[PDB]
Structure 1
Amino acid sequence: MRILMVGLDAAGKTTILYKLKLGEIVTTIPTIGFNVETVEYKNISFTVWDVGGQDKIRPLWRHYFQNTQGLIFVVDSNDRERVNEAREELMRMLAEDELRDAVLLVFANKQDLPNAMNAAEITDKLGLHSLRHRNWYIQATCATSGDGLYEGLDWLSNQLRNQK
């Protein structure tokens, strides 16, 4: 099954995967620049990738959103420099029908980081403090140890299957 674990560059995508261990990741280069890591094997299927509009205008993203039922948002809580880079992509995932119920799994790892915004504004400059109604979920995620990952994956799985 497919859950699009979206996230910026160096957020934590490869680590989470390092744990799950869906087998050496085939990191090929589809479009001049746009790389996608089809980390899809067995029950789990993660079409890995990064942000960037929608490549050099190709309907592959749409076909992903259409068939996908999952939604794992990994927010480099630290990257406070490009902060809105997510909001920019998310911009489309706003109205999009294909991904209505799809539970957005806000894995907010890298919060305790000295660089990142102070403790309180952690969930501020993100916009997840006021944005409600949308289907989402956010718990303290520690990929290194493994914490955060459990509650997230389980909650998502249950919600999606149960909601319908």
Structure 2
Amino acid sequence: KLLDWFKALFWKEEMELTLVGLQYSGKTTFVNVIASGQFNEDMIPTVGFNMRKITKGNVTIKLWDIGGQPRFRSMWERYCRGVSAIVYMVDAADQEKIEASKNELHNLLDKPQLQGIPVLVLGNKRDLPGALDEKELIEKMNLSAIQDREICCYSISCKEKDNIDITLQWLIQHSR
């Protein structure tokens, strides 16, 4: 659509960014969508690690699950220095996991080396009946308690491509 126009604009952009959130929160699906189902994936530093380097065009994305490999957390956090932005993805329909996930976001932004980096929280799976909306996400994840930086929250759906356009707008506009 116009969505396809933003995808093209987005992959010419020279930026690093990070996509992190709990497992099964829609992370790879989201890349699928904005990459039109074609991209390169490479475990970092090598195979065996949770961390993945998505590349396509000029964009490189550092992608990991919070809780995939707890031992390597510090290594992952530190790898996310210098990024243009943080995309923190949550399943807005899985309300039982909201508290735990809200906590690792706050933990993540408590870290000095990641000071000042913009955060887009995405409340995915909006299509599922009863999934948390934008206002509620902000509420239940205490997003107003984060003010050391620029922080934005959108509700989206990868399976329906709802709000992916404004997401790409946000991202494209936040390259350094």
- Give the secondary-structure state (helix, strand or coil) at the position aligned to 1:14: helix
Higher helix share: 2
Aligned ranges 1:13-162 → 2 under 5 Å: 13-21=27-35, 22-23=38-39, 25-26=41-42, 30-31=47-48, 34-52=49-67, 55-57=70-72, 59-114=74-129, 116=131, 121-128=136-143, 130-133=144-147, 134-161=149-176
Paired AA for residue 156 in structure 2: T
Relative to structure 1, the CA distance from residue 51 to residue 62 in structure 2 (aligned partners, 3 Å threshold; closer, same or farther) is closer
What's the TM-score, normalizing by structure 1? 0.76
- Which has the larger displacement, 18-27 or 98-107? 18-27
Q: Deviations over 1:118-139 (max 9, x none)?
A: 89745432223x4352411122
Please say if residues 107 and 148 of structure 1, whose CA atoms lie closer than 8 Å, have aligned partners that are also in contact: no
Aligned partners of 2:135 and 2:106: how far apart in 1?
24
Relative to structure 1, the CA distance from residue 79 to residue 94 in structure 2 (aligned partners, 3 Å threshold; closer, same or farther) is same
Aligned partners of 2:106 and 2:133: how far apart in 1?
25
Aligned partners of 1:35 and 1:121: how far apart in 2?
30
Relative to structure 1, the CA distance from residue 74 to residue 117 in structure 2 (aligned partners, 3 Å threshold; closer, same or farther) is closer
Relative to structure 1, the CA distance from residue 20 to residue 159 in structure 2 (aligned partners, 3 Å threshold; closer, same or farther) is closer
Give % identity.
28
Instruction: Indicate the RMSD between aligned Cα atoms, in angstroms.
Output: 3.0
Please say if residues 51 and 62 of structure 2, whose CA atoms lie closer than 8 Å, have aligned partners that are also in contact: yes
User: Where do 5+ consecutive residues of structure 1 fail to align?
Assistant: none
Relative to structure 1, the CA distance from residue 151 to residue 116 in structure 2 (aligned partners, 3 Å threshold; closer, same or farther) is closer
User: Where do 5+ consecutive residues of structure 2 fail to align?
Assistant: 1-14
Relative to structure 1, the CA distance from residue 55 to residue 113 in structure 2 (aligned partners, 3 Å threshold; closer, same or farther) is same
* Residues paired across the two proteins, number: 158
What's the TM-score, normalizing by structure 2? 0.71
